Write a protein that binds this DNA or RNA. Structure first.
Lengths: 63, 103, 94, 63, 39, 125, 230, 213, 11
RNA sequence: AACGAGGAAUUCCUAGUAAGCGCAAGUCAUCAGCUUGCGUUGAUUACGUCCCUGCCCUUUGUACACAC
């Protein structure tokens, strides 16, 4: 319900946060399940508008 | 004032247009169109009301001199109003113009 | 479905009789020569006729409209309708 | 003052809004990408059109 | 505009109404006391 | 013999008995022609099935309805229910099944309450 | 070039009551007024600050708060102003407790305060006070809220000190041709200026200095008369 | 040249049924005069909720619209206007009185403004439904109004309420009646002519919302 | 006290 | 001489419901200063939410997969 409440600007901020986690790899492995579940749920909700967006920073971040 | 209501029903005053405080002698409906009434008075002006918007004269018509008491629309032209005053001098107005002055 | 019978006469007319009570319902005047073939779709949806003025006429049947009017060259002497594929065949006179 | 028509998609739940005010997510109609979180007043359901006067202001909670 | 003044602050009729009120009140009270005693 | 069929119609406390039999195309209600239904605004509420399915299907049968009970609006609603059910029952028995089914489609797609009443029973929560 | 009206006799303009909701006018709502009625014992009486402070203290309220004299003089200057003679404003007293009081523009107020206090207790208990000609009710207690009893197309503004000062003739001439104006005037002795924030559209001020409420009403009224050419 | 013939003999019912009735049989019209074709909801977001897609004869459809949550929305619009017109204190339970008044009002609307009375009604509704309202914040000692949007069912409810309330208040104490004043009201609201209670009240609501957004 | 969702948004 | 639909406060109500109308009975308690049946016409708005005022439950999975 929380991840459904937040809007798309905060979705983008969330993706930037997960990028910073992947750079801080030990947080990633210590909290690997939760991060995966939240990321996949946010993208499954917001897939339409996120794929509507055209942004090379989004492309590189998601890569 | 003029009182416009349907024939065959004296009970229902359908609309009451308060015109000038001088007595309105002649009150006609249009011939081609059927939502525009035109009435004169001893106020020496003839006002064209539109009976949907019966609060303000849609188009006032002045430029006469004394006691407008006759008026007539013209068959072919649905915009041209002849108005017979009381000093002679039959005026001919075109309503899609300004209308303050006779044509 | 077994409810309707179409009779195409030798002056163009199509009369549509109910078969339980054998009572007349309609009449379709598209042709003016004879009507040498009638058929109805399996969905009761469309209805084809073909007649000696070289004319195929595709009517609707749930509405009562005309969908199309094809004109071939020769007269038309037979029509066979395959409903499972919605293809009919017309034996012509060329 | 151009009014915009948006389309209610998802009636958000478990958000604590005041009684009689229901949060909602709308997709823009003339542009099939953007999504905006707004508040409504009466009865609202999904897939239905909503008129926005000020289109860019995203809605926050009402406690 | 016209103006108006406000208003702020029969003996036989008054005494009639006071005696009617007395009769009503004492009659009702005596009936209640009779019925209490009877029960 | 003569083909005939009897049907019923009910709003709250109104009863409508309709006998439809073959004939010359005349409708009566309670000893009066159908064009004298007294609530006078709801006469078209009585005319609903007649104009929904047309005037030929009525032009070849005689209908006779008699109503009692109820009040003005409930009696109008009982009349129209009895007429519609009598028409479709006659078209099933003495006329054919296709016409019956297309009448049911027309009547239902307009207003189901011409055929099957909705008894407004309570609901305790 | 322009004919005269047929009638040139002077006729009184019709009294503007709460029943009619079209004609453009001005409304003054003396809000947060202090009109309480107490019972001493054999008789009821309106609370005044100066004379009865031991029993005001027995209530426990503020002698600074309970002052009806300023509402009295506000009512005097309002209903004696020329725009009341022209019949273009009406007033409503919004008591601090919650009463709505409609005051018709025709009433002639007694000017000595003891007579006014007797009038006020008779009003706040009897709920209506009729004229001596006795065909009309001048002082009518009516029901909350004022938005339910106001004109339909109105502007509701507060008289606050901290708002930027404007010119009242400029504001009134800036108003539309049928958009009436309603001024909320704080009839408190001394206090905060934020009581009608759910009622009003905006706050305005009239001087860099604070005013008495009667002077504020007089300023707004004379600017309104100057605008509407009286 | 195509021709479909499903009529073979003239239909003469032995009970005489009049020509205007047989024309209604040709086409269902409201009160046997006003058609429902060429009647569009001029604004989207109300295509679903203003129901002019099922033609009707008289405005006394009795059906249970008060059970689910938007069956009210599926109810046809002249019945909504009718029930709101019989909503009063002394008019509670007189649908035939309300229907007679509605019929006379559509007569007046046709006579004055020659287009279509049902179209004037629908334009009135979609022009006076308010678009942005305010709700009072809780606060806990200090409350102000926060601006929110308003949903199409609430807009149609509010529109019909403002129309009938403005009419009843307008001919409360006059020498006019509810039919005359409601015809005047509907015509002005369809014009958007800013001299009707509906347009004034809607513009006030939206103005306050735009103020304290 | 902000709900979950609101607290995640602020953080 | 009172009186023009009745202030502040407080209460009640979600469909044949609120409200209007009448006809009838007088059933061992109650009821005639009225009570109880019966039909008639018959809507506006919510049908969501725990944000406020309350009330209530749980903080040990036990119940046997799978998932959490």
């Amino acid at each position: 319900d929380a991840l459904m409440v937040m809007p798309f600007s905060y979705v983008l901020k969330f993706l930037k946060f997960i990028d910073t986690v992947m750079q801080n790899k030990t947080l990633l492995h210590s909290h690997l399940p939760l991060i995966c579940k939240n990321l996949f749920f946010i993208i499954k909700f917001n897939h339409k508008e996120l794929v509507s967006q055209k942004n090379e920073e989004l492309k590189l971040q998601i890569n | 004032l003029v009182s416009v209501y349907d024939s065959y029903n004296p009970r229902t005053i359908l609309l009451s247009i308060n015109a000038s405080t001088h007595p309105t002698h002649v009150t006609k409906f249009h011939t081609q169109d059927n939502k525009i009434l035109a009435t004169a008075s001893d106020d020496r002006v003839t006002r064209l009301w539109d009976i949907s918007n019966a609060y303000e004269p849609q188009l006032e018509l002045t430029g006469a001199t004394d006691y407008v008491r006759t008026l007539s629309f013209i068959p072919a032209a649905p915009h041209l109003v002849a108005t017979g005053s009381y000093d002679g001098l039959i005026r001919l107005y075109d309503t899609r113009s300004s209308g303050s002055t006779p044509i | 479905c077994g409810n309707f019978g179409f009779i195409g006469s030798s002056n163009g007319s199509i009369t549509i009789y109910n078969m339980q009570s054998g009572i007349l319902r309609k009449k379709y005047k598209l042709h003016k020569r004879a009507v040498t073939g009638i058929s109805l779709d399996g969905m009761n949806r469309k209805m084809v006729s073909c007649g000696l003025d070289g004319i195929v006429g595709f009517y609707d049947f749930n509405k009562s409209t005309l969908l199309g009017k094809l004109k071939l060259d020769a007269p038309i002497t037979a029509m066979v309708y395959h409903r499972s594929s919605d293809l009919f065949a017309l034996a012509l006179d060329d | 003052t151009p009014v915009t028509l948006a389309k209610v998609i998802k009636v958000l739940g478990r958000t604590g809004s005041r009684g009689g005010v229901t949060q909602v997510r709308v997709e823009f109609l003339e542009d099939t990408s953007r999504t905006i979180v707004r508040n409504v007043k009466g009865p609202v359901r999904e897939n239905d059109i909503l008129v926005l006067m000020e289109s860019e202001r995203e809605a926050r909670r009402l406690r | 505009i016209p103006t108006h003044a406000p208003k702020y602050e029969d003996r036989t009729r008054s005494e009639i109404n006071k005696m009617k009120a007395q009769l009503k009140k004492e009659r009702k009270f005596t009936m209640k006391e009779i019925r209490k005693d009877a029960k | 013999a003569v083909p005939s069929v009897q049907t019923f119609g009910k709003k709250k406390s109104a009863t409508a008995v309709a006998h439809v039999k073959a004939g010359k195309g005349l409708i009566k209600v309670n000893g009066s022609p159908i064009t004298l239904v007294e609530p006078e605004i709801l006469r078209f509420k009585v005319y609903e099935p007649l104009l929904l399915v047309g005037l030929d299907k009525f032009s070849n049968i005689d209908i006779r309805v008699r109503v009692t009970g109820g009040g003005h609006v409930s009696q109008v609603y009982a009349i129209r229910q009895a007429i519609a059910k009598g028409l479709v029952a006659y078209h099933q028995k003495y006329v054919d099944e296709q016409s019956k089914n297309e009448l049911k489609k027309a009547f239902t797609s307009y207003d189901r309450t011409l055929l099957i009443a909705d008894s407004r029973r309570p609901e305790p929560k | 070039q322009k004919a005269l009206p047929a009638s040139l006799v002077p006729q009184a303009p019709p009294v503007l009551t709460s029943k009619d909701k079209i004609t453009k006018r001005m409304i003054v709502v003396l809000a947060m007024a202090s009109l309480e009625t107490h019972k001493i014992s054999d008789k009821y009486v309106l609370l005044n600050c100066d004379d009865h402070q031991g029993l005001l203290k027995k209530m426990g309220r503020d002698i600074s708060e309970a002052r009806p004299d300023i509402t009295h003089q506000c009512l005097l200057t309002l209903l004696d102003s020329p725009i009341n003679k022209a019949g273009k404003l009406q007033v409503y007293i919004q008591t601090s407790r919650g009463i709505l009081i409609e005051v018709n523009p025709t009433v002639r107020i007694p000017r000595t305060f003891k007579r006014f206090s007797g009038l006020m207790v008779q009003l706040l208990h009897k709920l209506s006070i009729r004229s001596v000609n006795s065909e009309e009710k001048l002082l009518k207690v009516i029901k909350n809220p004022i938005t339910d009893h106001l004109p339909t197309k109105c502007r509701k503004v507060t008289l606050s000190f901290d708002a930027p000062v404007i010119r009242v003739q400029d504001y009134i001439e800036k108003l539309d041709d049928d958009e009436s104006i309603c001024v909320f005037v704080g009839a408190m002795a001394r206090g905060k200026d934020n009581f009608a924030d759910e009622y009003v559209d905006e706050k305005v001020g009239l001087s860099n200095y604070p005013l008495s409420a009667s002077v504020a009403c007089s300023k707004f009224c004379h600017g309104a008369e100057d605008a509407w050419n009286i | 040249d195509f021709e479909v013939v499903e009529e073979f003999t003239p239909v003469v019912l032995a009970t005489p049924i009049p020509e205007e009735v047989q024309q209604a049989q040709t086409e269902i019209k409201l009160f046997n005069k006003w058609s429902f074709e060429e009647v569009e909801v001029k604004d989207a977001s109300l295509v679903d909720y203003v129901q002019v897609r099922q033609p009707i004869f008289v405005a006394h459809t009795a059906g249970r619209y008060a059970n689910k949550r938007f069956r009210k929305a599926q109810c046809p619009i002249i019945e909504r206007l009718t029930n709101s017109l019989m909503m009063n204190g002394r008019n509670n339970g007189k649908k035939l009185k309300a229907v007679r008044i509605i019929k006379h009002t559509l007569d007046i609307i046709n006579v004055l403004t020659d287009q279509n009375p049902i179209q004037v009604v629908v334009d009135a509704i979609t022009n006076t439904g308010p678009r942005e309202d305010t709700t009072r914040v809780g606060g806990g000692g200090a409350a102000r109004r926060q601006a929110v949007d308003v949903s199409p069912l609430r807009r149609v409810n509010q529109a019909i309420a403002l129309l009938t309330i403005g009419a009843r208040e307008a001919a409360f104490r006059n020498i006019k009646t509810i039919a005359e004043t409601l015809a005047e009201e509907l015509i002005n609201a369809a014009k958007g002519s800013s001299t009707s209670y509906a347009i004034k009240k809607k513009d006030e609501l939206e103005r306050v919302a735009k103020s304290n957004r | 006290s902000l709900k979950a969702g609101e607290r995640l948004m602020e953080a």
